[PDB]
Amino acid sequence: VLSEGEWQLVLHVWAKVEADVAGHGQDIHIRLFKSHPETLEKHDRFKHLKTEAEMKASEDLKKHGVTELTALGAILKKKGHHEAELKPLAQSHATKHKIPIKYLEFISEAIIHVLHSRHPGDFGADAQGAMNKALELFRKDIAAKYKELGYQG
Numbered sequence: 226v227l228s229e230g231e232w233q234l235v236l237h238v239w240a241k242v243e244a245d246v247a248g249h250g251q252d253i254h255i256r257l258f259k260s261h262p263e264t265l266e267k268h269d270r271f272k273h274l275k276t277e278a279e280m281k282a283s284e285d286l287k288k289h290g291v292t293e294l295t296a297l298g299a300i301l302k303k304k305g306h307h308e309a310e311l312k313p314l315a316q317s318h319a320t321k322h323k324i325p326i327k328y329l330e331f332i333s334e335a336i337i338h339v340l341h342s343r344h345p346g347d348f349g350a351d352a353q354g355a356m357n358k359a360l361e362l363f364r365k366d367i368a369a370k371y372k373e374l375g376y377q378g
């Protein structure tokens with residue numbers, strides 16, 4: 226459970242994000258792939274972009290990240306009251322794409338890293354801290370849902 230102050234910082238920085246969902250989406254995916262190329266393998270139609278310029282200019286990849294960041298931002302805005310939208314996501318991620326919880330840390334890392342790099346002044350220690358707290362709540366709660374549907378994190 227996050228303090229009201231922590232939630233405010235989360236949605237403060239995220240408002241920043243919303244000034245360019247697509248661009249942030251791209252840099253997070255690129256960050257993520259580079260740090261952990263096993264990640265790119267679950268992303269089966271993005272498997273074949275070989276460079277970041279290729280990655281950047283791919284509409285498909287682009288739109289993909291918007292879809293993703295938009296779902297994530299809607300979840301953050303519920304300030305933890307989010308089972309109604311955590312459910313369809315864990316369902317497709319648990320029993321389809323088959324994304325292990327470790328992969329959710331990986332992307333949480335990329336997220337923190339990308340936010341800091343673009344919004345340092347709005348992403349100091351308190352803010353950084355809050356976002357971690359939020360994303361660890363997200364990963365706690367989706368793990369719980371992963372188990373309810375069979376096969377774990």
Ligand code: HEM
Pocket residue numbers: 264265267268269270289292293294296297313314317318322324328329332
């Ligand atoms: C903040 C964490 C992320 C969120 C909220 C999330 C959300 C979403 C959403 C909303 C979609 C589109 C509909 C659906 O399939 O549910 C999706 C698709 C997908 N997600 Fe995630 N994503 C997250 C993490 C990622 C990561 C970490 C991976 C791989 C390591 C993964 C792989 C995929 C794949 C492979 C698709 C299908 C794309 C296809 O159409 O080609 N997810 N995700």
Ligand SMILES: [Fe+2]
Pocket residue numbers: 254268289290293
């Ligand atoms: Fe993705």
